[PDB]
Enzyme design. Structure first.
Site, PDB file in Angstrom:
ATOM      1  N   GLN B  27      39.121 -22.514   3.254  1.00 29.65           N
ATOM      2  CA  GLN B  27      37.739 -22.805   2.894  1.00 29.65           C
ATOM      3  C   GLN B  27      37.670 -23.536   1.556  1.00 29.65           C
ATOM      4  OE1 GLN B  27      35.055 -19.429   2.332  1.00 29.65           O
ATOM      5  NE2 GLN B  27      33.567 -20.337   3.743  1.00 29.65           N
ATOM      6  N   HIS B 106      28.347 -18.352   2.225  1.00 28.05           N
ATOM      7  CA  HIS B 106      27.755 -17.286   3.022  1.00 28.05           C
ATOM      8  C   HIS B 106      27.025 -16.342   2.096  1.00 28.05           C
ATOM      9  CE1 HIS B 106      26.943 -14.360   6.073  1.00 28.05           C
ATOM     10  NE2 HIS B 106      27.702 -13.440   5.503  1.00 28.05           N
ATOM     11  N   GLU B 229      40.216 -19.747  31.806  1.00 28.68           N
ATOM     12  CA  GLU B 229      39.249 -20.685  32.369  1.00 28.68           C
ATOM     13  C   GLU B 229      37.919 -20.703  31.601  1.00 28.68           C
ATOM     14  OE1 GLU B 229      39.505 -21.695  36.692  1.00 28.68           O
ATOM     15  OE2 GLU B 229      40.081 -19.576  36.838  1.00 28.68           O
TER      16      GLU B 229
END
Lengths: 325, 325
Positions: B27, B106, B229
């Site tokens: 970050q 945040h 999938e």
């Protein structure tokens, strides 16, 4: 136990000398037919008159009707939507089958639930790539492929498994991995997965989250990102490295929240709900419901689709995706 | 709220500002490297030395957290949520001066008031919606990751322009910005990851896998049906919403989605999500997380070890080893 298999495990080139017809020339049909031809197999196309027919001849395939293509063929692979297969089979394929032929499907629905019964002197096999037509064709062109299940429902000739595996090899799936299954297991797990988890469960989970946030007064645009847009990153991580890799990559705050809140949302009762979904797949109830809806003019599907067109997450989502390159 | 872009960034508020990025993980590195590439005066504040050195290797002026803050006009704190309060009190707070600006990606610590920044200092947020690797990568490709921005306190009158210019500097304004508040960002972000993206999702997949394996279906095949999938499906939703996904899957799968999704994710599940949201709003979750950290991460420890022993994780690792791409 079951081990994954590759090109080295295809013991017999069973498609050697076979005359192959692919029924249907949608994305699925196209991928199979094109891949097999490039592998070095004799492929023709059997489809009703129209755009696909013309494109099939545009691509250089000896194109015929479904009935005539079945007449000419040793191996017939049916790649059409489940709901029209029974009609198409009874009217055009069944009267043109001969002993020692082989009939293939990419999904076991009609054979497993016995909407279609193939004569017992004819093989029935399956090669089920775990991907959409365009991905099956593309990865083959790029030199590898999409992994696949194979199975045999009835083996009249003694050659059916080798045909199934060679078909898998012929479409590129053996380049990346094969898993043997049964028609019953493929059909029931495939229906269960898409219903309880991949499609039904997932979209319902997303929608429920969106509702909770928007009803609590949070802005829908922002909710869109937090329950839908950012899911791609997460699933890409799970795809590559499982829960482990995903949870390493997210913050410890997110990871902790995952462990703590996941189980509060998906409870034992939810697991019981899934068991009920599985039961209606095993007992034929879902299969009959789907075919009955189709026969009645798709009234349930119609109402479902118009409802989904009016979802707030779908309207907001469309606008936001427009606003992002 | 409307989406905003580089043209909506009126004032280059980071002009003439000395910038310190606190922390040099993925970050920190992403933000710092993007802003430097964008021409900003960036220094790094981090403890010695396994981050300190990498920072120096990358060519940044690298100092202690205390000294970097002392030098800086703008200080962006990009360290794990659970260590920010200790770090802020000991190394950052003593070195703030009036008219400085403190940023976060945040709002956890500021919103729940674990950290209180002095009233003559701006507090802003730029919250790119992606991991550091992604924030840097997209930036290098001439692209970016969308971001939220917000202001918690505006002492100078320049806080919003600072936040938006940060977003622009890291590449986010290239693709789209949404204004929010510290409260809504914190609560929506925690809820999304907990109820849907990470917690909800992993629990949904695990429940599906359990149902199948407990019913006697092979786990290898269950892995593909509930996890592998899923990437295709979410890629479709990411690009075109539920609409595109459901157009692309078979009518059998689509029908199953509509019918079984609501059977699995019920009103009771929605109520479970409301309880999750409530414990985010009332600060119970926040306290639980920080208390687990202060106690030496005993819950996280047990959770992580349990997750390492999941059958779907073992089977999945072996299956992914057996598949290249």
């Amino acid at each position: 136990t079951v081990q994954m298999e590759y090109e080295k495990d295809v013991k017999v080139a069973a498609l050697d000398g076979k005359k192959i017809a692919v029924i249907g020339y949608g994305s699925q049909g196209h991928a199979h037919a094109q891949n097999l031809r490039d592998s070095g197999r004799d492929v023709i196309i059997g489809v009703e008159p129209g755009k696909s027919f013309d494109k099939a001849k545009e691509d250089g395939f000896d194109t015929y009707t479904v009935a005539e293509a079945t007449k000419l063929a040793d191996v017939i692979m049916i790649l059409a939507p489940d709901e029209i297969q029974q009609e198409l089979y009874e009217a055009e394929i069944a009267p043109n089958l001969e002993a020692g032929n082989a009939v293939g499907f990419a999904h076991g629905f009609n054979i497993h639930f016995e909407f279609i019964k193939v004569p017992a002197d004819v093989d029935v096999f399956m090669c089920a790539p775990k991907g959409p037509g365009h991905l099956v064709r593309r990865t083959y062109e790029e030199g590898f492929g999409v992994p696949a299940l194979y199975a045999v429902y009835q083996d009249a000739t003694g050659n059916a498994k080798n045909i199934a595996m060679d078909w898998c090899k012929g479409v590129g799936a053996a380049r990346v991995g094969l898993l043997e299954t049964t028609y019953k297991e493929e059909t029931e797990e495939d229906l269960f997965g898409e219903q309880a988890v991949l499609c039904g469960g997932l979209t319902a989970l997303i929608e429920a989250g969106f509702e909770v946030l928007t009803e609590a007064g949070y802005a829908p645009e922002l909710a869109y990102f937090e329950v839908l847009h950012e899911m791609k990153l997460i699933v890409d991580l799970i795809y590559e490295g499982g829960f482990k890799k995903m949870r390493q990559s997210i913050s410890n705050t997110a990871e902790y929240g995952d462990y703590v809140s996941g189980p509060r949302v998906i409870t034992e009762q939810v697991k019981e709900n899934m068991k009920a979904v599985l039961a209606d797949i095993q007992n034929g109830k879902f299969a009959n419901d789907f075919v009955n809806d189709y026969k009645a003019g798709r009234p349930k599907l119609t109402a479902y689709r118009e409802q989904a067109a009016n979802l707030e997450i779908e309207k907001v989502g469309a606008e936001l995706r427009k606003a992002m390159p």
